[PDB]
Design a protein around this ligand. Structure first.
Ligand code: NA
Length: 240
């Protein structure tokens, strides 16, 4: 997250760190949202590589013991069947991860609530992106979980020629684009939390930013629209 602030450690208890095994250690690669005690929602593109993945819930500082973490292996990966890794603009950038164990819930570890199917946010709706992704274009990962306030940009504006044009689909949510605050590499797969009727819900799964940089004016961060995939999510969980 470029232009973020450090999150309080109990603000976003559904945020997870998706990590892969790297030598004798683990490396953060993406975010995710805990949606059942044994299921995480992330971006399909985060699990394109043939790696050993784990999830960390209750994580705050990637580089220090928080005293709250639970580390769990990924047992099964179910990518959306229409996902195509060389065409992120087509959409379908979503995957579910079944965890090897069911995590224990507490103030640091909670299920993300999802919007009702079909819900579309009005333009300029209040949301936060969260994650440990780069804090500058071509920068480095954050140590501590970051948040940035990113107002939605509705489809009509986001798919206009000076924004994303044809590349944004109605199956996506756009947020931000102010040239200061954005998602960045390593935030993919994590949540966009939007405040609706007094309650935050996870309306987005971070999918992409501009090839020209993270915080680029009129290139808002683009997220898979969770509310387009409710039936898919429920179907996967019910059949696994
Ligand atoms: Na930690």
């Amino acid at each position: 997250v470029v232009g973020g602030t450090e999150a309080q450690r109990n603000s976003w208890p559904s945020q997870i760190s998706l990590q892969y095994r790297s030598g004798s250690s683990w490396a953060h690669t993406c975010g995710g949202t805990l949606i059942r005690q044994n299921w995480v929602m992330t971006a399909a593109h985060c699990v394109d590589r043939e790696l050993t993945f784990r999830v960390v819930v209750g994580e705050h500082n990637l580089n220090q013991n928080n005293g709250t973490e639970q580390y769990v292996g990924v047992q099964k990966i179910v990518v959306h069947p229409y996902w195509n890794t060389d065409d992120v603009a087509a959409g379908y950038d979503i995957a579910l991860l079944r965890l090897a164990q069911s995590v224990t819930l507490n103030s640091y570890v909670q299920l993300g609530v999802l919007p009702r199917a079909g819900t579309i946010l009005a333009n300029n709706s209040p949301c936060y992106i969260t994650g440990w992704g780069l804090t500058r274009t071509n920068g480095q990962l954050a140590q501590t979980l970051q948040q940035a306030y990113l107002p939605t940009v509705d489809y009509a504006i986001c798919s206009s020629s000076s924004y994303w044009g044809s590349t944004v689909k109605n199956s996506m949510v756009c947020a931000g684009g102010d040239g200061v605050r954005s998602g960045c590499q390593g935030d993919s797969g994590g949540p966009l939390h939007c405040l609706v009727n007094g309650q935050y819900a996870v309306h987005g799964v971070t999918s992409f930013v501009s090839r020209l940089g993270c915080n680029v004016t009129r290139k808002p961060t683009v997220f898979t629209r969770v509310s387009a995939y409710i039936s898919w999510i429920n179907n996967v969980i019910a059949s696994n």
